[PDB]
Amino acid sequence: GSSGSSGMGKGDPKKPRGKMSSYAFFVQTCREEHKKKHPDASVNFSEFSKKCSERWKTMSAKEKGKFEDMAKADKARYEREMKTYIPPKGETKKKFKDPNAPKRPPSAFFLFCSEYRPKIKGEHPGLSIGDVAKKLGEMWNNTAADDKQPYEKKAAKLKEKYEKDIAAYRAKG
């Protein structure tokens, strides 16, 4: 969530941290290259630090360019981790309905719970529109991916309609 800071600091293993910027990378790009020029060199970490600072600013835009293109490349490869990681729930008035924006079509889960609602609802009268649905919340989770083959494939088609409508809402061209 708009994680302000980023990089070596303090936190937990859960969240895949490891995002470095142009500098963070440049500072290590000069030190590594040095070890090659002077292996038995008595270079200091501090002296090499203050240097990278004024050394990074002095560097002409062109010099920074590469450092920038290489840095951004990481901001992407780093996300790969987040994918494997699943954070808690903390959405703020998101995925909500809006009259201005185009309504989003149903999904596999909705197609299943919707096609099952009229099935279980009749078998179990005691339940109610509310509960009945709350009961499908787990049914889907258990459902095997394969079983979601049709519920998914179909949905995909619908999405198109939305992707076509929204294409206007934003009008980014």
Q: Tokens 């630090």 — which residue?
A: 49
Coil, strand or helix: which one is 21?
A: coil
Short-list 114, 133, 112, 132, CA closest to 123 = 132
Q: So where are the chain's domains?
A: 1-87, 88-173
Write the burial class of residue 113 (CB in 10 Å: 0-12 exposed, 13-18 middle, 19+ buried): buried
| Type and span of the H or E element at 115 | helix 108-123
Exp. method: NMR
Residues contacting 6, CB < 8 A, separation 6+: 17, 19
Sign, CA dihedral 151-157-159-165, equals negative
- The answer to whether 10 touches 73, Cβ cutoff 8 Å, is no
Residue 11's alpha-carbon distances to 14, 57, 86, 138, in angstroms, are: 9, 30, 16, 32
Q: Residues at the annotated binding site for heparin?
A: 8-17
DSSP 118-131: HHHHHH-SSS-HHH
* Arch. (CATH architecture) of 1-87: Orthogonal Bundle (1.10)
Fold held by 88-173: DNA Binding (I), subunit A (1.10.30)
Write the burial class of residue 105 (CB in 10 Å: 0-12 exposed, 13-18 middle, 19+ buried): middle
What number of CA atoms fall less than 13 Å from residue 77's CA on the CB side? 8
Q: Is 1-87's fold the same as 88-173's? A: yes
- CA–CA separation, 110 and 126 (whole Å): 22
| Type and span of the H or E element at 150 | helix 148-170
- The answer to whether 159 touches 105, Cβ cutoff 8 Å, is yes
- CA–CA separation, 162 and 167 (whole Å): 8
Short-list 118, 172, 115, 100, CA closest to 148 = 115
Write the burial class of residue 31 (CB in 10 Å: 0-12 exposed, 13-18 middle, 19+ buried): middle
Q: Residues at the annotated binding site?
A: 8-17
